[PDB]
Amino acid sequence: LRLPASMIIDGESPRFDDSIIPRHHGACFNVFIPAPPSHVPEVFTDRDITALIRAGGKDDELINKKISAKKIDHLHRQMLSFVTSRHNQAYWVSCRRETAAAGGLQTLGAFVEEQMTWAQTVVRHGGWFDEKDIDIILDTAIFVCNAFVTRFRLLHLSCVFDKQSELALIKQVAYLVAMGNRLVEACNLLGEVKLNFRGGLLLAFVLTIPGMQSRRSISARGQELFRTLLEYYRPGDVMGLLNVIVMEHHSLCRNSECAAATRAAMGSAKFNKGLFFYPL
Amino acid sequence: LRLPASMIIDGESPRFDDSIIPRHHGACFNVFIPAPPSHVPEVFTDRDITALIRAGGKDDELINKKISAKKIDHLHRQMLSFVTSRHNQAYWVSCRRETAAAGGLQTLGAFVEEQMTWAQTVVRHGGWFDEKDIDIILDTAIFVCNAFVTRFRLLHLSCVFDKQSELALIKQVAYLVAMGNRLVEACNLLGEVKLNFRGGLLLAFVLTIPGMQSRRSISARGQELFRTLLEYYRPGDVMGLLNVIVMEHHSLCRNSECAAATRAAMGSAKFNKGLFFYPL
Ligand SMILES: [Zn+2]
Ligand SMILES: [Zn+2]
């Protein structure tokens, strides 16, 4: 009965419940969800990302989505076209959004790798994020970040980070992002902090792109941080950090629910729709 | 800004650091998670819960896993001799844990329907929520409930639920369940308020089993609420409410992002391993 703002609470309780449940529609094996943007103008782009876009529609192993960054800054010539193509826009965003929601940290990590590598390329070849220019990868970047942090909290963090205050910051940042409403305070708290440790740097790596997309309502130190992070970023980093963190702790901690919560928190990597490229 | 507990702020602003990142392992495609529980001893069961079990090893469509409440009422002492088997425990709990952990609201709704129907049955034959007496479906009940609500938080609830009071309840209850282990506070809150709307009744339906497993720590209203909710529930209620909220909303809310979040959060129902039965 610590209730801000409600009006009618029960005075008995009576209590009853039957009327509102639709018991007459019978079984329901599928929920009547709105239609997807299945409509694809089916634009054929050139000259040979055909297999790369078809890979952006499959769920192969990550081992089948490799590109060395040499190719990325090379084929950027019209990869920027495909991503900014006014055709097929909300479709890929929807596809990539529906997978980012669910789930498994391995998948979301690879997504961050791709979106970090892409953004580092599109600032290398000139051009910062307008307010706001249309672009598939960066438009889903915020969805990737939130879903990453949220599926991240399902780790036994009290066990993985056997550190005093590191765990405190990580817990608060993961909290701030997980409530959705408060990102500017999550990504600006990251900034006036030490980042010697791994886990906080891993979160800062994730909040790079969305920290940049919001670089107007944030602190002064934040912009310096995320621009530095994107500048000195390299591919395979986020997966490296995440991997070595889980590797070492579970090389030691042979608990039960810790190994379980970890095993659950990162599902298989097979699920990729719609992942275009895994950078290396 | 305000930082309660920390040891070293930064005035200096050092960089980067690059040594903390293990840049020498190279390429990572599968994170090195601990081993999965070993299945394949199997229990030599027998007509005909094998067919039921085998449905727990496959990602079939919901309709292919259907069952009638009259059947699982008949098939009880048999089915109970499996879910309470000495062997193959943490395996099936892991399968269910990881699936609900990734899966979307449709998958989790099926799990909820199953576990509620199962608890109804084992109660109907004198059983009770022992702690612990090893019931696969009731162990996973916490993970299902949590993950359901954590993903329920993806919908544009400000657009799905009109009156600010019902919405406010849904938002706070979701905040408690999803964020932290403040579960008992949530069950108390559901216990206070009259549930004559589909949002609160749906969530309360989800939390019945974890509430009934926390019967000692929960307020009087909570104990009576979840007792009655467990007795008067009849299969389909959860999906029926979930569906009918979506259906009746998006039949007049053609908002691009509201339907986008709804599509992303629901997710396909083909993923359900291991879902033993979908009750009717
Ligand atoms: Zn551990
Ligand atoms: Zn709406």
Numbering used by the authors:
A (entry chain B), B (entry chain A): 175 to 454
What does the paper say about this structure?
KSHV encoded multifunctional protein ORF57 plays a key role in promoting viral mRNA accumulation and translation. Previous biochemical studies showed that ORF57 is stabilized by dimerization, which is critical for its function. Each monomer contains a zinc ion chelated by four residues, the cysteines at the position 333, 427, 432, and the histidine at 423, which form a consensus zinc-binding motif.
Two kinds of ORF57 crystals obtained in our experiments were used to collect X-ray diffraction data separately. The spindle-shaped crystal crystallized in the reservoir contains 0.8 M Li2SO4, 0.1 M BIS-TRIS propane and other crystallized conditions shown in Table 1. Moreover, in the dimeric structure, only residues V168-L175 and S455 are unidentified because of the poor densities. The dimeric structure is formed by the extended N-terminal “arm” region contacting with the globular domain of the neighboring monomer and shaping as a coffee bean conformation with approximate dimensions of 69.0 × 50.9 × 50.0 Å in the asymmetric unit, with a deep groove extends around the interface of the two globular domains. The N-terminal “arm” region of one monomer protrudes out on the globular domain of another anti-parallel monomer, while the C-terminal end is enclosed into the globular domain of the same monomer. Thus, the arm region in the dimeric structure lacks two unstable small η-helixes. PDBePISA analysis by comparing with other interactions at the dimer interface showed that the “arm” region makes major contributions, mainly (>75%) by its hydrophobic residues, suggesting the “arm” region very likely participating the dimerization.
